[PDB]
Design a protein around this ligand. Structure first.
Ligand SMILES: Nc1ncnc2c1ncn2[C@@H]1O[C@H](CO)[C@@H](O)[C@H]1O
Length: 295
C-alpha cells in the first residue's frame, strides 16, 4: 500500500540489466537517482502485479525500497543500488574489489536478516524462492546489502525439493543461503565445473552433491553451512536461528563497515582436489576466538 507515479516524470536512461521478467534501467525522478523495471510485453503483467502487492507490504533495511509504481506503461520505481549486484562484486569485470572475511560474513548476516523478515510476515510468510548473488544488491560503499527480485534463479542455488516439483517451505531459502555463504567465502561460482544444461546440476544436487569443502574453514561456520545444505528440509536451521548465530560470530569479524576501495588481481586455481581454499582469510578470526576461549 503506497505511492503512485506518472511515467512522464521519469527520465529513463541506460539499461542496467534484466532479471526474472522486466528490464531494469537507470533513471531520474524528482531529481533523485532511481532504478526502474518495466514490462516488455504483457504476461509479465501478472507477475508485475504480484510483485506490487508483495513489495507494498515489505519495509525492512535489507530489502530494496520501492518508491512507487505506475500502470501508464507499468513499472516499479525502486531505489538505485549504487554498489551494483553481489554477483558483479564477486565475479564481475576486471577491476574486481578486494573484500575481507568480515565483509563476507556481514553480507550473509544482512541477507539472513532480510529473509528472516520475509519468513516472519503476517498473515502468511513470503518465501523469496530465488536467492542468489544476481538478486543481492550493495549500497553504502558495498557495505550494506539488500535483497530484491522475489521469485514470487539457476539450479546452482535451488533446494533439491524444489526441482523435484514436490512441496517446499521457507527452508528452501535456507538452502540457497548456505550456497551463497560458500560462494562469498571461496569467491567461486558454485558447480561451475559441471556446466552444460541446467538438468546436469539438478541431477548432481539431487543425488547429494554439494560444493567442495573449504580448507581451514572454522568448525562453527562449516557446521552451519552444511546444515543448511541438508537434503531433509526439516533438518535445516530456521532463518531466525541463522540470524542469531551469524550475529554472534560477527563479534570475531570486526571491520565490516570499511568500504570496498582496493582493486584486487584475483587468481583462482581450480584443480579439483579434495577441497578448495578460501578467498577470505580466517587467521584473525582464530586469534580473536582464541582470546575469548582457550584457542
Ligand atoms: N535498485 C537497483 N539498483 C541497481 N541495479 C539493480 C537494481 N535492481 C535490480 N538491479 C540489477 O538488475 C539486474 C537484473 O535483475 C541485476 O543484475 C542487478 O544488478
Amino acid at each position: 500500500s503506497l505511492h503512485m507515479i506518472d511515467y512522464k516524470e521519469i527520465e529513463v536512461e541506460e539499461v542496467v540489466g534484466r532479471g526474472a521478467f522486466g528490464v531494469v534501467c537507470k533513471a531520474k525522478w524528482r531529481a533523485k537517482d532511481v532504478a526502474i523495471k518495466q514490462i516488455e510485453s504483457e504476461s509479465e503483467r501478472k507477475a508485475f502485479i504480484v510483485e506490487l502487492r508483495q513489495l507494498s507490504r515489505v519495509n525492512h533495511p535489507n530489502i530494496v525500497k520501492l518508491y512507487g509504481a505506475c500502470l501508464n506503461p507499468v513499472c516499479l520505481v525502486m531505489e538505485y543500488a549504487e554498489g551494483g549486484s553481489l554477483y558483479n562484486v564477486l565475479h564481475g569485470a576486471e577491476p574486481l574489489p578486494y573484500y575481507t572475511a568480515a565483509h563476507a560474513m556481514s553480507w550473509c548476516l544482512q541477507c539472513s536478516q532480510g529473509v528472516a523478515y520475509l519468513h516472519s510476515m503476517q498473515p502468511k510468510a513470503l518465501i523469496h524462492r530465488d536467492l542468489k548473488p544476481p538478486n543481492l544488491l550493495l549500497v553504502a560503499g558495498g557495505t550494506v546489502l539488500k535483497i530484491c527480485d522475489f521469485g514470487t534463479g539457476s539450479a546452482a542455488w535451488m533446494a533439491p525439493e524444489v526441482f523435484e516439483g514436490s512441496n517446499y517451505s521457507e527452508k528452501c531459502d535456507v538452502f540457497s543461503w548456505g550456497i551463497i555463504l560458500w560462494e562469498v567465502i571461496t569467491r567461486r561460482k558454485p558447480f561451475d565445473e559441471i556446466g552444460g544444461p541446467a538438468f546436469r546440476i539438478m541431477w548432481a544436487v539431487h543425488n547429494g552433491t554439494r560444493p567442495p569443502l573449504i580448507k581451514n574453514l572454522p568448525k562453527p561456520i562449516e557446521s552451519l553451512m552444511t546444515r543448511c545444505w541438508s537434503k531433509d528440509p526439516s533438518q535445516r536451521p530456521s532463518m531466525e536461528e541463522i540470524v542469531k548465530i551469524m550475529t554472534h560470530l560477527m563479534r570475531y569479524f570486526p571491520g565490516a563497515d570499511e568500504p570496498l576501495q582496493y582493486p584486487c588481481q584475483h587468481s583462482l586455481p581450480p584443480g579439483e582436489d579434495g577441497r578448495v581454499e578460501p578467498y577470505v582469510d580466517f587467521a584473525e578470526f582464530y586469534r580473536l576466538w582464541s582470546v575469548d576461549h582457550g584457542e
